[PDB]
Each structure stands twice: as C-alpha cells, then as structure tokens.
Design a protein around this ligand. Structure first.
Ligand code: 4WY
Length: 149
C-alpha cells in the first residue's frame, strides 16, 4: 500500500526498537496482532514520507507499545529468512533496529486495546522470542546493551 521495499532483495523495509529500562536489566515486549500469544518487540513498516529509520522506529514504538525514549544506539539490520508458504531464499523482511532508553510508558496508545505490553529480563525475553520463532529479533536483542544475568 504505502510500504517501502529493498530495491535489491525486494524485501519489505521495517524499523523497530529494543526499549530498555534505564538500569538495562529489562526490555519492553508486546504481543503480535495475528498470533495473539506470541511476545515480540515494537516494529513496523517504513512509509514513503519518513526521512530515516529512527522516525519509523519511534512512531512504531509509540503506536504499538505507548513507549517514549531516546535512541542511544543503532543496532543495525537483521533479516526475516522465512521460506514462502508454497515451500513444500530471498528474505521476507529487513529490520532496522535501534536501542531506546525508556523515559515513559503511557496507559493509552493507538493499539492499547489490540496488544499487551510487559518488561522482561534478558532470560525471559530470550525464551519469548524462541517461543515466537523469531531469531532475527533475538539477534537484535543480543546487539543491545541489556545486562545478561
Ligand atoms: O508474520 C509475519 C512474517 P513471518 O511469519 O515471521 O515470516 O509478519 C507479519 C506481517 O506480515 P508479513 O508480510 O508476512 O511479514 C504483517 O504485515 C503485513 O501484513 C504487511 P504485508 O501483508 O506484507 O503488506 C504485520 O507486520 P508489520 O507490523 O510490520 O506491519 C504483522 O505484525 P502485527 O501487526 O501482527 O504485530 C507481522 O506479524 P508479527 O511480526 O509476528 O507480529
């Protein structure tokens, strides 16, 4: 619709955040809208108007998790290497991830009724993304400044 794709791989361009607490013991996570039981991290599709990936990230973090913070690091890109449904390979999604230091969480936000939202230690957060079958999101988490204990 209004989405943007890599001119090389034709993959859909996404940006998101690893929203860490100030102490950096916990990371904010949200539930998928399609898969209502899977815990992921805030991200969404880049739109034409958006000048940089930081814009898409901070927007998507707000819309999806009602989270406000400053980007303290670029974590680089990870790919969603998901084989096409008629599989029985070019990547599906390129994600541009930033580390964000949480300044505030709001009780209202545009998908406050469509998603849940919780802070998880590195351990619980690792298992959640295993359960979710999203290792490219775990790769991003690992590039963060999160404490591993
Ligand atoms: O499920 C997947 C892809 P995967 O099954 O991991 O290969 O992602 C959907 C995405 O559709 P797709 O085009 O297949 O990537 C969904 O996107 C689309 O439907 C866009 P399109 O159908 O490709 O135009 C949508 O992703 P975006 O947030 O980036 O929009 C879904 O996110 P949701 O809104 O449910 O949180 C996202 O699910 P998830 O990341 O598990 O939460």
């Amino acid at each position: 619709e209004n989405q943007v794709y890599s001119p090389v791989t034709g993959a859909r361009l996404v940006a998101g955040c690893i929203c860490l607490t100030p102490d950096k013991k916990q990371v904010l996570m949200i539930t998928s809208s399609a898969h209502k039981k899977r815990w992921i991290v805030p991200k969404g599709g880049v739109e034409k108007d958006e000048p940089n990936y930081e814009t898409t990230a901070q927007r998507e973090t707000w819309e999806e998790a009602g989270c406000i913070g400053k980007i303290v690091a670029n974590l680089g890109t990870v790919e969603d290497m998901r084989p096409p449904k008629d599989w029985n390979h070019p990547p599906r999604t390129e994600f541009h991830f930033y580390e964000l230091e949480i300044e505030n969480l709001l009780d209202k936000f545009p998908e406050c009724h469509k998603r849940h939202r919780k802070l998880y230690s590195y351990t619980e957060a690792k298992q959640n993304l295993i359960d979710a079958k999203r290792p490219e999101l775990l790769e991003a988490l690992n590039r963060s400044a999160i404490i591993k204990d």
